[PDB]
């Protein structure tokens, strides 16, 4: 708390040396509470220059979130009121559901863990949108090419979406999300998109059951992986996509979509409602999903879980 506004205060100073007085003034904490807290976020993992004379240089943050600096990205933020993050927890989107209950707030959760130290991004994301149900599915269809986009910036391959929720690097699921929706007497009171990032693993991080199909953003960048650099690129792609689904039918990103999409030319395990083996031909302009089943009779799926 003392950590976080400390923090916060050298985050937004740089590239700038600040000095323990300053922090203390503008803080308004007793010099020496300065000096523990300093020498915590060292011991936390912050790369923070200190030099006589000068003062205090955040050089770089270590692979946890923290409140303080995650706040900077929300105060900049049309669209969340603010972030809650936490060290760990069992489930972003239990705490999301829970925290979304008598306000109409937007905001997201991030955990570092959810029960690999550190190395996946977890957050759910709580929405309001005032849309009518028949355009409450499209969602998905918006916001994960927000997150295929995001994602992109990061990876020298291409990185691509298997319909509904699911997003991979070449043969590796490196994402995958979930949205839930809330509704009262009258109608949606909230979304919850709930998403699971791979960002650093290492192949050896993954369990070997999985590891052929499992990948992590770091494994496809040359460069060290920037974990809040990532945060801060995928809340603006959540963002804007978030309005263009407020604002475009789905028949505008609908061609985008294909283009991005790794279900193509190939023949898939599809299960509704249950099985069938057959191939996508197509995503219709409502965000249906057609498919052409081995005895070549066409189905129209609005959600089945699409397996390789």
């Given at each position: 708390?003392?950590?976080?506004?400390?923090?916060?205060?050298?985050?937004?100073?740089?590239?700038?040396?600040?000095?323990?007085?300053?922090?203390?003034?503008?803080?308004?904490?007793?010099?020496?509470?300065?000096?523990?807290?300093?020498?915590?976020?060292?011991?936390?993992?912050?790369?923070?220059?200190?030099?006589?004379?000068?003062?205090?240089?955040?050089?770089?943050?270590?692979?946890?979130?923290?409140?303080?600096?995650?706040?900077?990205?929300?105060?900049?933020?049309?669209?969340?009121?603010?972030?809650?993050?936490?060290?760990?927890?069992?489930?972003?989107?239990?705490?999301?559901?829970?925290?979304?209950?008598?306000?109409?707030?937007?905001?997201?959760?991030?955990?570092?863990?959810?029960?690999?130290?550190?190395?996946?991004?977890?957050?759910?994301?709580?929405?309001?949108?005032?849309?009518?149900?028949?355009?409450?599915?499209?969602?998905?269809?918006?916001?994960?090419?927000?997150?295929?986009?995001?994602?992109?910036?990061?990876?020298?391959?291409?990185?691509?979406?298997?319909?509904?929720?699911?997003?991979?690097?070449?043969?590796?699921?490196?994402?995958?999300?979930?949205?839930?929706?809330?509704?009262?007497?009258?109608?949606?009171?909230?979304?919850?998109?709930?998403?699971?990032?791979?960002?650093?693993?290492?192949?050896?991080?993954?369990?070997?059951?999985?590891?052929?199909?499992?990948?992590?953003?770091?494994?496809?960048?040359?460069?060290?992986?920037d974990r809040y650099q990532f945060?801060e690129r995928?809340?603006?792609?959540?963002?804007?996509?978030?309005?263009?689904?407020?604002?475009?039918?789905?028949?505008?990103?609908?061609?985008?979509?294909?283009?991005?999409?790794?279900?193509?030319?190939?023949?898939?395990?599809?299960?509704?409602?249950?099985?069938?083996?057959?191939?996508?031909?197509?995503?219709?302009?409502?965000?249906?999903?057609?498919?052409?089943?081995?005895?070549?009779?066409?189905?129209?799926?609005?959600?089945?879980?699409?397996?390789?």
């Amino acid at each position: 708390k003392y950590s976080q506004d400390v923090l916060q205060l050298l985050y937004k100073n740089k590239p700038n040396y600040i000095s323990g007085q300053s922090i203390a003034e503008s803080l308004n904490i007793s010099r020496t509470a300065v000096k523990k807290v300093i020498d915590q976020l060292k011991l936390e993992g912050c790369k923070i220059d200190s030099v006589n004379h000068k003062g205090h240089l955040l050089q770089q943050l270590p692979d946890i979130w923290y409140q303080g600096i995650i706040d900077q990205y929300t105060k900049s933020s049309a669209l969340f009121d603010f972030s809650e993050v936490y060290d760990s927890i069992d489930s972003t989107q239990l705490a999301a559901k829970k925290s979304l209950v008598g306000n109409q707030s937007s905001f997201f959760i991030l955990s570092d863990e959810q029960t690999s130290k550190g190395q996946g991004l977890w957050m759910s994301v709580v929405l309001r949108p005032n849309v009518a149900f028949s355009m409450i599915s499209k969602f998905n269809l918006f916001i994960a090419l927000g997150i295929r986009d995001a994602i992109q910036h990061f990876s020298q391959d291409e990185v691509k979406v298997k319909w509904p929720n699911d997003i991979y690097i070449d043969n590796g699921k490196v994402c995958g999300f979930l949205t839930e929706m809330v509704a009262n007497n009258d109608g949606i009171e909230a979304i919850i998109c709930g998403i699971g990032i791979n960002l650093t693993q290492q192949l050896e991080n993954f369990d070997e059951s999985i590891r052929h199909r499992a990948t992590s953003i770091q494994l496809h960048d040359k460069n060290k992986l920037d974990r809040y650099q990532f945060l801060e690129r995928l809340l603006q792609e959540i963002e804007k996509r978030y309005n263009q689904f407020l604002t475009l039918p789905f028949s505008e990103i609908r061609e985008e979509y294909n283009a991005a999409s790794n279900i193509w030319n190939r023949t898939l395990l599809f299960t509704e409602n249950k099985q069938f083996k057959g191939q996508a031909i197509d995503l219709d302009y409502d965000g249906y999903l057609i498919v052409r089943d081995e005895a070549g009779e066409s189905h129209r799926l609005i959600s089945a879980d699409i397996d390789f």
